[PDB]
C-alpha cells in the first residue's frame, strides 16, 4: 500500500495532473518487467502482495490482469 499506493479518493479535481501517472508509474513499470519475464518463463518469478483493502490497493494491477 505504501509504495504503489492509491492516489487518495476525491483528489479534488475531476482528473488531476496526468491522473497521477506520476506515482502509479512504478507499479506499471514493475508489472511490465515481471510479465516480460513471466511470459518468458513461468516457474521463475511469482509475486505475492499484501494490502489493507482491495479498493485501497491500486486498480491498475487488476486493469492489467495481474
Amino acid at each position: 500500500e505504501a509504495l504503489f499506493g492509491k492516489p487518495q479518493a476525491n483528489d479534488g479535481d475531476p482528473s488531476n495532473n496526468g491522473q497521477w501517472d506520476n506515482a502509479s508509474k512504478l507499479l506499471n513499470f514493475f508489472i511490465n518487467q515481471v510479465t516480460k519475464i513471466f511470459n518468458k518463463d513461468n516457474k521463475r518469478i511469482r509475486v505475492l502482495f499484501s494490502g489493507k483493502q482491495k479498493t485501497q490497493i491500486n486498480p491498475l494491477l487488476f486493469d492489467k490482469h495481474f
Binding site: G18, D21, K40, N42, F62, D63, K64
Partner: protein, 1030 residues
Amino acid sequence: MKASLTFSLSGIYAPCSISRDIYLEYGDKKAECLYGTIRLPQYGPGCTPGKIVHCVLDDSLPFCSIVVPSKLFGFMPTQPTMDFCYFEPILDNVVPVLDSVTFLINEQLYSKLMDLPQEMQQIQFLHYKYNINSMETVVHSRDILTSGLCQILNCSPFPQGLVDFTETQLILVNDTEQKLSALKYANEDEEYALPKIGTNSALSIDLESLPCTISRDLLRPAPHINDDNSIYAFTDAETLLRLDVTSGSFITVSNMGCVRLVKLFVLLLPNGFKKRTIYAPPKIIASFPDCSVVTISKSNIGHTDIPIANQVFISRVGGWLQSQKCFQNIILTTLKKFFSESKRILCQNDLIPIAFDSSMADLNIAEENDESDDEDELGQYYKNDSLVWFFVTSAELDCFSKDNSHFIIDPNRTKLITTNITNRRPLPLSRSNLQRYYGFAETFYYDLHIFPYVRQLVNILETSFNCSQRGITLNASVLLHSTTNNVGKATMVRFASKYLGIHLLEIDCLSLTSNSRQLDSTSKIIGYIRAKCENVLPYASPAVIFLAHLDSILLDVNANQDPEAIKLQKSINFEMSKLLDDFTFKFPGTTFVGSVNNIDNVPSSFRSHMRFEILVPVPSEAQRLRIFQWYLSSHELNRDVQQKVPVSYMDNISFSSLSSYSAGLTPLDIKSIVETARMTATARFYQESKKCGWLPQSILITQEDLSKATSKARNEFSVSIGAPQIPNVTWDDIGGIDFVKGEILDTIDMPLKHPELFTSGMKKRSGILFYGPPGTGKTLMAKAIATNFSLNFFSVKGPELLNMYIGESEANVRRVFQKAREAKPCVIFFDEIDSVAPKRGNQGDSGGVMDRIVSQLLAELDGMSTDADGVFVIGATNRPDLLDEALLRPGRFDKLLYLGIPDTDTKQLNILEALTRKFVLDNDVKLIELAKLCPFNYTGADFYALCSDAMLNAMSRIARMVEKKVSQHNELTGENISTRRWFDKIATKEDTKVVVKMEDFLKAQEQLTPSVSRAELNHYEAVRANFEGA
C-alpha cells in the same frame, strides 16, 4: 527410452514387434497382451504426443530396435525416414478402453456397409478387412484405414484407447462433402517420377527460412562435433538426389552474383514440411531478402580446402538495441562466447545474429571461468530472448588465395576487431519469422483482411517507405486512441513494424521519465528522447519512432492551476513538436507513431499539427474468433512450459461459440481466459494422474473449462466496474408477477434474443418505470431481474449523486452513462428518482440543481436511444406524480409498469408459496386458509413480515424448550451447564431445526396490521386510474 526404429509397410494395426532385449529388461512374462507408448523426434520444439501401440515379443530385431507400421503415421517409408524413436514400456498394462469411437466412410461404401439386415455382420467385416480385435486392438484419433475411404475421425474420451467389440460404441458416417477423396497418406500419390535424374548442373529453387531450430541429434550424417552448427540448411531427399550429392555436404547458394556456402541435409520422415524446397536458418536468408528464389549449385570445395583467416573486421549493425548502453557488455560477451564455441565460417559482406538473455544482461559474470566447461548448462539456465546483427565489414586471409569470399575463423589463431556501425534494412516477416525461429514471445499474427484499421496503418508505412525510396519525403504521423485500455495498439504497432521490415524505435514516456516536476524536467525529457533517437536513428533508417502513452507527458492543463506550471507544460509541448519536426526533416524516410488512451487530453494545437489518426476498437466477434484461433495454437501454447508433457485442446471446440460469449472483451481478457483454461486443465490432469494411476499421454482442454473461465472473466469485469448489489435472487423467491412478467421479458430479452428484427434504424424500447403502493416489492423485482438475466447491472441512486458544489453531479451522470455504454448490454437502475424531480418555483429547488440533473437524465436518454444497443433503464418510485413530467414521455419511458397490490387470492397464494420456499412447514400448515383470511391490502412486505413473525414464534417455542432443557438438567444432573455449552455441544440438529405450526401464522395474522391506510390505497388507485385507463 533411446531405441532404434524401423518402419513396416504392413497395415496400420499390425502389432509393433519388440526386440527380445527391449521387452526382457522389465516386461512381465505372463502378461496376456503387451502395449507400449512411443515418442518420436519432432522438427519443432513441441514434442508430439506418443502413440500407444499393441506390441508383440520378438528375437530377430537387433539390440534395442522396433518395427512399427508407417501407416500409423499417415505415411509410408518411401523417403529416408527417422532412424530411432523414444519408447516407454507401460507397467501394469492398464490400457484405457474407449467408450465410443467415430469412423468415416464414403457414401458408396457406407451404403453397402449398412444395407445388411443384421448389425453384428459389420463387425466381422472390419475384423476381416482391418484385423481388429476386442480388448486387443488399439485405435487413435485421426487414424486412417483405407486411403480416402476409411478413417477414424475421433474417439471421444481419449483420442487413443483400447477397443472391445461387445462394449465399444461405434459411430460411423457417410461423406457427402467427399472429404475423404482429398485425404491420402503422405508421399502416397507421388509415384516415382524422377525429374531429369542427376542431369542438370545448377537449378533455381525456392529458398525458405527454417520455421524452427534443429537439434544436433537429427542430422545424417553425424556432423563433426567441432563443426559449425550455424551453417546447416535442409531439404528433401529427392532434391538431394537430383543434384547427385550427399547429406552433410557443401553447396553454394547465390543470386545475381552474390554467393554463400552452406551445408545440406535431409528431412528424415515423418515431416509436414513443404516438399521440393530448401530450408535454412535466418543467417543465410538475411543476405537474400528480396530474392524469394535462389540459384542452387553443387560446391566442389571440401572442408580441408577452406583457408584459415588472419584478420577479421566486423561492424555492429544499426539497431534500437545497439544504443542500449545498459546492454552493450552482454552483446559482445555473447559474441565472443559464440565464436569461442567452435570455428565459424563466414565471408565478406555478411551478417551475424547473436541471441542473448536480456534479463540476464545486468550481471557482468566475469571471464575468470577459464573456458567454462558447462557453457551448455549456463545456456539452458538461459532462454535466449533478444537478437542482434553483426556485420563483417572486411577480413584478411593469411594464405594468399584467388578465393576472395570464403574463409574460416579460429578461436585463437585469428584476430578480430569491432568497428563503426553499419545500416541494413531488416528482413520482413514474409521471408522469415525471426521471433519464432529462436522462440521469443511470438507477436500475435495479424490478417489485415479481417483487421481493416491495421491495413490502414500498414498502408501508410509502406507508402512512406516507397516515397523515400522514390526520392520523395512526406512526413507521417499516426495516433492510436481507444475507449478502453489493452486493446492492442502497441501490439498492432509492433506487428506492422515487423511485417514491413522497418526498424522499430520505441519509448514509453510512462516508464523512464525519471523526472516530472523539476523545472529541468521538460529539458531532461526532451533532451533524453532527442539523445536516444538521434543516437540510433542515423544508421538505422528506415525506422519508426514509437511513444507509449505519449499523452502522459502532453496534455491541456486546466486554467484551474498555477500559471508557471502551465507555462512549463506549454514549453514541453512546443519542444516535443519541434523535436518531431526536426527529426523528420533531418532524417528522410523516417516516421513515428503515438499511442494514447483518450484523444481529449492531448494538446489540440499538437493534434492539428499531425497527419494521421486511427482508433483501435475493442475486438469484434470475428476478431475475437481469430484471436482465439491464434492463442489456442499449440505451438504458442507450450512456449513457456518446460514440463515434458505438452498440452492441447479437443477438436470439438466450437470457437464460434466462445466468440459469441466474448462480447466486449479484449485481447488481455482473451489471454487471461485461455491461460486460465490451461490452468484448470493442468490441475485436473495432475489430480487424475494420481487418481487412476495410469497417466494420459498429453494434457487436454475442454469447452466447459473455457465456459468457466469466461464466467470468471465476467465476474472480474463486474468487480472492476462494481455491480455488487446482486447477491442472489430467483423468480422462485417471489410470486404474483404474472402480467408484468410478459412486459419485462418482451422489453428486455426479446431485443437481446433477436436484435436483428429491431436493427432497422428504429427507436427501440426506452425504459420501464416501476410505480406502485409501498411494500409490493419493486426493489425485489429489480434485484431479481438483475440477477436472473445475468447482465451488466449498475445502479445509481439519485440522492448519492449530488455533491457539495454544483456541476460535478452532472459530471458523474455523464461519465456513468458513457461507462455503461462501454459495458453493453447494460442495465442502469435509478432508485427513488423522485428525489430529483421538484419543478421550478420559489417553493421548489430554488437553485435549479435538480433541473440541470434532469437535463442530464433526459439528454443522455435521447442520446442513448440512437446507438445504445444494450442499455436498459428501469425506474423505481413510490410516488410518480412528483416525478418530472418531462420523463414520462416515451423515448424516456414507455412502460409505466404498475406493481399493484395482490387483489386476487391467486396473487397472494403465489406470493405465500414463493415465500415459504425454504420454510420447514409442518403438514398442519394450510397456505390456502391464510390466502382466504388476508384482505386485499396486503403486500409482499406484509406477507414477509407475517412469515417472519410466525417463524419468530416457532423460534420462541424452541428457545423456551431449550431453556427448560438447560434448567431441568441443572437440577437432575446438578450440572449448571449454561445454555452456551448446550448451543456448542448439546444443541443437536433437531433442536436447531426450525419447525412451525399453522397457529403461529394465524396468531401473527391476528396481530398483523397492514402498513398502509386504505386512504393511501385509494390515492394510488386514483393514480392508476389516470395512468391506465387512457
